[PDB]
Ligand binder design. Sequence first.
Ligand SMILES: N#Cc1ccc(N2CCNCC2)c(F)c1
Ligand SMILES: N#Cc1ccc(N2CCNCC2)c(F)c1
Length: 460
Amino acid sequence: QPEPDMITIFIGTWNMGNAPPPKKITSWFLSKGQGKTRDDSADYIPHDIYVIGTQEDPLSEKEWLEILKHSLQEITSVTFKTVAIHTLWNIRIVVLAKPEHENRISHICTDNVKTGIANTLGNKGAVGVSFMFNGTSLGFVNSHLTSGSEKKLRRNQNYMNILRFLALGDKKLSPFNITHRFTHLFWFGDLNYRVDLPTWEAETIIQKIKQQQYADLLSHDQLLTERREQKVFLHFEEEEITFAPTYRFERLTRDKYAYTKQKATGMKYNLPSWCDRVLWKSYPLVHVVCQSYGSTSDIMTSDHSPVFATFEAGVTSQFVSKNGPGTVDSQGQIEFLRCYATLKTKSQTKFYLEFHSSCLESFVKSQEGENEEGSEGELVVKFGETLPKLKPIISDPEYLLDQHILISIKSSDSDESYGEGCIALRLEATETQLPIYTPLTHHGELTGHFQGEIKLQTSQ
Ligand SMILES: N#Cc1ccc(N2CCNCC2)c(F)c1
Ligand SMILES: N#Cc1ccc(N2CCNCC2)c(F)c1
């Protein structure tokens, strides 16, 4: 039984509009409809992992699990194992995996975040799942963000609360939020960003959709434009959208968008919009390739169409040598030269670094850096040649070049992280000084940069 170096992952997001699904939803799991669709020749090939996010889901977990498993069994003739299911209000995440993966999957975590306060607390937020797949950490966030064309800022706030407070993955990674805890992080849901065009242009928008001419609409998609201005989802990717807006349809057809203001909408227009989205963030130089991104055309119980995305994702094996795990491997070391952090902070305190990696027995604290002023006002924290020599548990290059070092820069005064980032050990050379770089974030906002040189010694 060889361990895989690649898996495929299905991501689905559907706002079910508080209606039961139709009897057949197989088109969703087959990535068939509009957009970047999956080749017919793959229909019987199961994905390794299926992650299903619903919003406005009226079903019990039991009712939905039965529909999902029976759907996949009809497609694949495989009885999928339930990895996890977590529901907050009517927001749900289900993770299913091929039975051969049962022993490869461990450290399963679930959590939820409720967004807003009083008025704004009661139905929006996120659910999430994480786990290990052999040596690879996977996270999944299904969020239902604030609705309404005039609330993009609220949505961006919801995003930041979710990434700050969703507690998934390795708790030992205490300085790091979910945007740094996983080899691969998929974030999807009814993110509720709208096409921000005048109300009077509704029929023009519909015309453009019927012509499959999305360019003039996507140029006003609030998620793309907010991402472009680094207001939200910084360092996440999204595949090009080549499918029609997935909201707001008349139910039981896909022929009609229902956009006009109604008492039932709070007298808000719902111009056709790409509310339903899949984004990802993977550690640097890990294989991740989107192989489908689209919407179904034949599932019409909701005022949203289901969205699918599929990915090839690189994975690593659970490595054992004569030495680590359970000791260091003296044949391995990670050295840092000419390193400095550049920080946006207006504060003057001393800083130190923490290095966190599953290639280390535990995290490593550096000495304090030396603060200097940058030529354009910035705080520069010089580590020069002072950073420690890191001692990985395994020196085999087939292991070590697949690893990553998370970096937090912390205040000596408060022990609070001012910035977090990640460095790949997938180097062009070993025993060679090579440039390294990561942006630093805190609460998912850019706070600085870390750069320098690395010298990696493996047993080869
Ligand atoms: N596919 C799969 C799969 C793998 C592991 C678990 N479990 C749950 C919590 N207890 C121990 C581990 C599971 F439910 C499903
Ligand atoms: N409209 C738009 C838009 C275009 C580009 C980006 N970026 C740059 C490339 N890398 C990250 C994504 C973006 F966020 C939004």
